Design a protein around this ligand. Structure first.
Ligand SMILES: C=CC[C@@H]1/C=C(\C)C[C@H](C)C[C@H](OC)[C@H]2O[C@@](O)(C(=O)C(=O)N3CCCC[C@H]3C(=O)O[C@H](/C(C)=C/[C@@H]3CC[C@@H](O)[C@H](OC)C3)[C@H](C)[C@@H](O)CC1=O)[C@H](C)C[C@@H]2OC
Ligand SMILES: [Cl-]
Length: 190
């Protein structure tokens, strides 16, 4: 009578247990509430087809552990860019404010995950924005490279290979050796 559905947004994988005759609205609304966003502003896909809120898992022949894609990026879709260094970035929200340039002291919120989807840190969890000198060589290389070109109000997803992160050493008993890091960075100020 109930089903578990995996919702993947490109950063994490969250699961939802829902009755097969409950409209997907419930899942979509619970997902959106986590992101601080209105449900209608997000796009959910199952088997490549747009989910409508009034559809039930029964309607769509869903089964236990089926995957739903949650699209949080701009209407029209997005592209993930791999740069010369092997850093990947994806602009989820394009900023409209000042552009971040090397040499500025910038202020951000961030969340970091491992590729398995476990969360290792968030500035949100400390209610403490994070400030750093962009291009200063004091943060990991993927950050110095990846935050450049963001605009204030922007949300950018960085996928950082370990040579641009913590390499073979890892960090703080929470980042393992040779791990890719996934950050969402929201630019607050420059
Ligand atoms: C005196 C030092 C204290 C000073 C600590 C702070 C200002 C508090 C600050 C919020 C860090 C967090 O403290 C809760 C915590 O953030 C993580 O959880 C994290 O999300 C992360 O990965 N971040 C933080 C956000 C920017 C990107 C990245 C980073 O680049 O962080 C940088 C980092 C660790 C760089 C290492 C430095 C050693 C090099 O050898 C290595 O080179 C490979 C790269 C941080 C910002 C350093 O510049 C400055 C510091 O370390 C780490 C997993 C572990 C880290 O705790 C320490
Ligand atoms: Cl509904």
């Amino acid at each position: 009578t109930h089903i578990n559905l995996k919702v993947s947004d490109g950063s994490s994988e969250i699961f939802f247990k829902i009755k097969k005759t409950t409209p997907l609205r419930r899942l979509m609304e619970a997902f959106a509430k986590r992101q601080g966003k209105e449900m209608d502003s997000l796009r959910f896909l199952y088997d490549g087809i747009r989910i409508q809120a009034d559809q039930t898992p029964e309607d769509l022949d869903m089964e236990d552990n089926d995957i739903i894609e949650a699209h949080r990026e701009q209407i029209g879709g997005s592209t993930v860019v791999t740069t010369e260094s092997g850093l990947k970035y994806e602009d989820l929200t394009e900023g409209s404010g000042a552009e971040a340039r090397a040499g500025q002291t910038v202020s951000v919120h961030y969340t970091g995950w491992l590729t398995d989807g476990q969360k290792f840190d968030s500035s949100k969890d400390r209610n403490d924005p994070f400030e750093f000198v962009l291009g200063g060589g004091m943060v990991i290389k993927g950050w110095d490279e990846g935050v450049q070109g963001m605009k204030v109000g922007g949300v950018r997803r960085l996928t950082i290979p370990p040579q641009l992160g913590y390499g073979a050493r890892g960090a703080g008993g929470v980042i393992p050796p040779n791990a890719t890091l996934v950050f969402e960075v929201e630019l607050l100020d420059v």
